[PDB]
Scaffold this active site. Structure first.
Site, PDB file in Angstrom:
ATOM      1  N   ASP A  80      29.482  -5.692 -29.422  1.00  0.00           N
ATOM      2  CA  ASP A  80      29.939  -4.445 -28.833  1.00  0.00           C
ATOM      3  C   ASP A  80      30.916  -3.757 -29.782  1.00  0.00           C
ATOM      4  OD1 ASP A  80      30.414  -2.500 -26.881  1.00  0.00           O
ATOM      5  OD2 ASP A  80      31.784  -3.760 -25.698  1.00  0.00           O
TER       6      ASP A  80
ATOM      7  N   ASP B 238      17.722  -6.486 -31.605  1.00  0.00           N
ATOM      8  CA  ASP B 238      16.687  -6.766 -30.615  1.00  0.00           C
ATOM      9  C   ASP B 238      16.864  -5.974 -29.329  1.00  0.00           C
ATOM     10  OD1 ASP B 238      15.391  -8.778 -32.196  1.00  0.00           O
ATOM     11  OD2 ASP B 238      17.040 -10.143 -31.661  1.00  0.00           O
TER      12      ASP B 238
HETATM   13  O1  LIG Z   1      38.078  -7.596 -25.611  1.00  0.00           O
HETATM   14  C1  LIG Z   1      37.165  -6.532 -25.772  1.00  0.00           C
HETATM   15  C2  LIG Z   1      37.217  -5.520 -24.639  1.00  0.00           C
HETATM   16  O2  LIG Z   1      36.887  -6.254 -23.468  1.00  0.00           O
HETATM   17  C3  LIG Z   1      36.776  -5.433 -22.319  1.00  0.00           C
HETATM   18  O3  LIG Z   1      35.707  -4.483 -22.410  1.00  0.00           O
HETATM   19  C4  LIG Z   1      34.467  -5.147 -22.205  1.00  0.00           C
HETATM   20  C5  LIG Z   1      33.438  -4.064 -21.936  1.00  0.00           C
HETATM   21  O4  LIG Z   1      33.397  -3.202 -23.068  1.00  0.00           O
HETATM   22  C6  LIG Z   1      32.451  -2.130 -23.006  1.00  0.00           C
HETATM   23  O5  LIG Z   1      32.487  -1.431 -24.246  1.00  0.00           O
HETATM   24  C7  LIG Z   1      31.047  -2.696 -22.809  1.00  0.00           C
HETATM   25  O6  LIG Z   1      30.083  -1.626 -22.747  1.00  0.00           O
HETATM   26  C8  LIG Z   1      31.017  -3.575 -21.567  1.00  0.00           C
HETATM   27  O7  LIG Z   1      29.725  -4.188 -21.420  1.00  0.00           O
HETATM   28  C9  LIG Z   1      32.069  -4.670 -21.713  1.00  0.00           C
HETATM   29  O8  LIG Z   1      32.115  -5.506 -20.552  1.00  0.00           O
HETATM   30  C10 LIG Z   1      38.086  -4.663 -22.077  1.00  0.00           C
HETATM   31  O9  LIG Z   1      37.945  -3.742 -21.021  1.00  0.00           O
HETATM   32  C11 LIG Z   1      38.569  -3.929 -23.304  1.00  0.00           C
HETATM   33  O10 LIG Z   1      39.866  -3.445 -23.052  1.00  0.00           O
HETATM   34  C12 LIG Z   1      38.617  -4.931 -24.445  1.00  0.00           C
HETATM   35  O11 LIG Z   1      39.159  -4.366 -25.623  1.00  0.00           O
END
Ligand SMILES: OC[C@H]1O[C@H](OC[C@H]2O[C@@H](O)[C@H](O)[C@@H](O)[C@@H]2O)[C@H](O)[C@@H](O)[C@@H]1O
Ligand SMILES: OC[C@H]1O[C@H](OC[C@H]2O[C@@H](O)[C@H](O)[C@@H](O)[C@@H]2O)[C@H](O)[C@@H](O)[C@@H]1O
Length: 596
Positions: free
Chosen positions: A187, A248
Site C-alpha cells: 500500500d 497481480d
Molecule cells: O501503518 C500504515 C497505515 O495503516 C492504516 O491504514 C491502513 C489502510 O490504509 C489505506 O491506504 C488502505 O487503502 C487500507 O486498505 C488500509 O487498511 C492507518 O490508518 C494509517 O494511519 C497508517 O499510516
C-alpha cells in the site's frame, strides 16, 4: 496450413496467480484495527486465527492477513526487515506462519518494501542484505518520511537511487516469501510516487514515476511465481500500465472503511484521475474490467464487512459482486462481529464460481472508456465464462427505492446459439433450460446463477467480448453481424511495444488435437494472420506459436469462420490469439469454438 511464429510481446506480469483464476480467499485484521484505529493485539490475532481454523479454513479461507497500523513495528533483523507485526507481540513472523501451518493456513502480510523504519536507520550496525557496505542509514534522504506532511515520522521512504536499494527491496520481498507468505499487500505507493492524495492534500515528498516503475519491477522480480503481489494504492497511470506489468491485484475502490451500502455503492459515481479513480467497487470493477482476466489483473474490491450492512439481501449483494468480478474474497469480520453471518461467505455453489476461476465483465454497451462515458458498461449486469464453458451470471439492483427487473439474454447479450440450464445459487434451485437469466430484484438485492449450455457433439463457444483483453485489444460493436453484444477489435498493427491479444481459458477432458473455429471479420483487402498459442497456467507451451490465416472478405460487416486444429492438455489451457509484429493485416474477433 499454419506456419511457426515468434512469441507475442507481453505487457503484463502474467503470473500463475492471474492465469490460474480469481482472487484468493482470506481474512484480514481490518475489522479489528479500523474501528479501534490501532494495531491488532497478538492475542486477538490468535483468537481470530483459531476461529478461522474451525469455521472458515474449511471453505478455503486459509490465509490470515495482517494490515496497516505498522508504525509501531520497529524491531528489525540485522538487515532492517521487521521481525513481527507490532513491538507488543511476543512472537515473530516465523512463529505465526507455523502456528498457521499447524491449522492448514498461511500467513498474509501487509507491508511496503520501500518503507525503511526510523529505528533501523538509527542503528548504524544494520546493513543491506548481501551488501555489508551499505548501512540502512545510507538508504534514505534525511527528513524523507512517509506521510511527513501529516505528522508521519516513523517510516522513511527508501531512496531508490541510493546504492543498495535494489538489494534492500528485493531482500524484503523474499524475506516474506521465504517465510511462507503467498500474499503481500503493498500500500501507499501513490503517496510514494507523487506525495499527494486527492482526499487530503500534500502528504510527503514525491519520488516520481520512473522510480515508482523501477520499484515495481524490483518487487515483481523478487516475488516471482511464489508470492502474489497486491497493489493497494495504485495511481493507475496510462490505463494501469505499470501495475499491469508488475502486479497481480489492484484495488479499484476507496477503503471499506465503516462498510455498508454507501461504501459498496455510493460516495460518488464519477471517475477522477487520482487514486482511487472510482470510489465504490460497482464502478471500480466495471471501470477497470477491461484490464481483468487470465494473465492480466485481478481487481481487488477490498474487504467484506458483512455485519456492517443493513440486511441479509445487502450481504448477499456484497458477496455476489466480489465473486462476479473475480475479486479476492476477503473477510474482515472478526469473531466478535460475525454474529449469524458466516453463511454469507460459505455458500458452496457461490464459492464454486470462485474456485472454477470466474472473472466476469459488466455487460459492455460501447467501446468508450467507462471513465469517459458511464453508459458504456452496465454496472448492474455481469457475466463471465468458466474454462469448461459454463457461465456465472450476476444481476444487481442498485436502486435504493424501486424494485427493478434485470435480464441477461444468452443470445443477444452473451452471444450463444444454445441457451443453457440455469441454477439459482442462493435459492439452490434448478430452473431448467432457458434462453435468459432474469430476476425481479428488491432494492439492493441481487441474483447469481450458474448457466450450463448443452454441448451438442462437444461444441463449446467462447465469446471474445467476455474474454480477457491485452495490448490494446478491446470491445466494439461498430459493424453489424456479430453474435452477442459485440466483438473484439484492436487486433491490428499499432504504435506500442505490446501486441494486442485475447486470452480464453479452456478446460478439456484429455490431451489431444481439437477442432477450433474462429468467427472473424477481415476487410483489410488481403488475407490477415494472427499468432495462436495454447499454454499451461505456468506459461509452458502446449501448442504454437503459429500463424493462423483469415481470408479477406468483402466488407467489415461480413463475418466468416476460419477452421483450425489445436493441441490441448487435459484440464486447464490458456488459448491466446493476438497480432504480432510478423502477422499481416488485422481481424475483428467475435468468438472461438472448440469441439471437445
Ligand atoms: O501503518 C500504515 C497505515 O495503516 C492504516 O491504514 C491502513 C489502510 O490504509 C489505506 O491506504 C488502505 O487503502 C487500507 O486498505 C488500509 O487498511 C492507518 O490508518 C494509517 O494511519 C497508517 O499510516
Ligand atoms: O484495422 C482493422 C480495423 O479496420 C477498420 O478500422 C480502421 C481504423 O479505423 C479508425 O477509426 C480506428 O481509430 C483505427 O484504430 C482503425 O485501424 C475497421 O473499421 C475496424 O473495425 C477494424 O478493427
Amino acid at each position: 496450413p499454419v506456419t511457426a511464429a515468434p512469441p507475442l510481446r507481453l505487457a503484463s506480469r502474467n503470473s500463475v496467480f492471474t492465469r490460474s483464476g480469481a482472487g484468493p480467499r482470506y481474512w484480514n485484521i481490518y475489522g479489528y484495527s479500523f474501528p479501534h484505529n490501532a494495531p491488532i493485539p497478538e492475542n486477538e490475532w490468535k483468537v481470530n486465527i483459531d476461529w478461522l481454523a474451525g469455521n472458515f479454513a474449511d471453505f478455503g479461507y486459509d490465509i490470515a492477513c495482517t494490515d496497516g497500523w505498522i508504525e509501531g513495528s520497529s524491531r528489525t533483523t540485522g538487515n532492517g526487515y521487521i521481525t513481527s507485526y507490532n513491538d507488543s507481540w511476543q512472537h515473530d513472523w516465523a512463529y505465526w506462519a507455523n502456528y498457521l501451518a499447524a491449522r492448514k493456513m498461511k500467513l498474509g502480510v501487509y507491508y511496503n518494501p520501500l518503507w525503511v523504519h526510523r529505528a533501523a536507520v538509527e542503528d548504524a550496525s544494520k546493513t543491506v542484505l548481501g551488501r555489508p557496505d551499505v548501512k540502512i542509514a545510507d538508504l534514505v534522504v534525511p527528513g524523507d518520511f512517509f506521510a511527513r506532511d501529516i505528522g508521519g515520522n516513523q517510516l522513511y521512504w527508501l531512496d531508490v537511487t541510493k546504492s543498495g536499494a535494489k538489494e534492500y527491496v528485493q531482500g524484503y520481498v523474499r524475506y516474506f516469501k521465504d517465510l511462507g507468505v503467498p500474499y503481500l499487500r503493498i500500500d501507499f505507493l501513490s503517496w510514494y510516487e507523487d506525495g499527494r492524495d486527492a482526499n487530503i492534500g500534500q502528504v510527503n515528498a514525491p519520488h516520481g514515476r520512473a522510480n515508482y516503475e523501477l520499484a515495481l519491477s524490483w518487487i515483481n522480480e523478487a516475488a516471482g511465481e511464489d508470492m502474489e503481489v497486491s497493489l493497494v494504492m495504485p495511481h493507475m497511470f496510462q490505463d494501469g500500465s505499470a501495475e499491469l506489468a508488475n502486479g497481480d491485484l489492484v484495488r479499484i475502490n476507496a477503503d471499506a472503511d465503516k462498510g455498508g451500502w454507501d461504501r459498496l455503492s455510493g460516495m460518488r459515481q464519477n471517475w477522477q484521475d487520482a487514486w482511487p479513480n472510482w470510489a465504490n467497487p460497482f464502478c471500480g470493477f466495471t471501470g477497470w474490467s477491461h484490464r481483468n482476466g487470465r494473465g492480466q489483473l485481478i481487481l481487488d474490491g477490498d474487504f467484506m464487512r458483512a455485519s456492517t450492512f443493513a440486511s441479509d439481501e445487502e450481504r448477499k449483494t456484497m458477496m455476489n459482486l466480489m465473486v462476479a468480478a473475480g475479486s479476492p474474497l476477503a473477510i474482515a469480520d472478526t469473531y466478535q462481529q460475525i454474529g449469524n453471518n458466516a453463511w454469507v461467505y460459505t455458500n458452496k455453489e457461490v464459492l464454486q464460481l470462485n474456485a472454477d476461476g470466474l472473472v466476469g465483465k459488466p455487460l459492455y454497451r460501447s467501446a468508450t472508456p467507462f471513465s469517459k462515458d458511464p453508459g458504456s458498461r452496465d454496472t448492474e449486469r455481469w457475466a463471465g465464462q468458466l474454462p469448461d464453458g459454463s457461465w456465472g451470471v450476476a444481476l444487481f439492483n442498485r436502486s435504493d427505492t424501486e424494485t427493478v427487473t434485470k435480464t441477461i439474454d444468452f443470445a443477444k447479450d452473451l452471444g450463444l446459439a444454445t441457451g443453457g440450464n440455469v441454477r439459482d445459487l442462493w435459492e439452490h434451485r434448478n430452473l431448467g433450460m432457458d434462453s435468459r437469466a432474469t430476476a425481479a430484484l428488491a432494492p439492493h438485492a441481487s441474483a447469481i446463477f450458474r448457466v450450463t449450455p448443452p454441448k451438442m457433439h462437444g461444441t463449446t463457444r467462447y465469446p471474445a467480448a467476455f474474454a480477457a483483453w491485452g495490448g490494446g485489444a478491446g470491445f466494439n460493436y461498430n459493424h453489424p453481424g456479430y453474435d452477442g453484444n459485440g466483438f473484439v477489435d484492436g487486433l491490428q498493427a499499432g504504435s506500442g511495444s505490446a501486441d494486442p491479444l485475447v486470452t480464453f481459458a479452456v478446460q478439456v477432458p484429455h490431451r489431444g488435437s481439437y477442432a477450433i473455429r474462429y468467427r472473424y471479420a477481415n476487410a483489410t483487402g488481403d488475407t490477415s494472420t494472427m499468432t495462436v498459442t495454447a499454454e499451461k497456467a505456468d506459461r509452458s507451451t502446449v501448442d504454437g506459436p503459429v500463424h493462423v490465416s483469415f481470408p479477406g472478405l468483402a466488407t467489415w460487416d461480413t463475418w466468416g469462420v476460419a477452421d483450425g486444429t489445436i493441441t490441448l492438455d487435459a484440464g486447464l489451457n490458456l488459448v491466446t490469439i493476438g497480432r504480432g509484429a510478423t502477422d499481416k493485416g488485422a481481424i475483428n474477433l467475435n468468438w472461438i469454438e472448440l469441439d471437445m
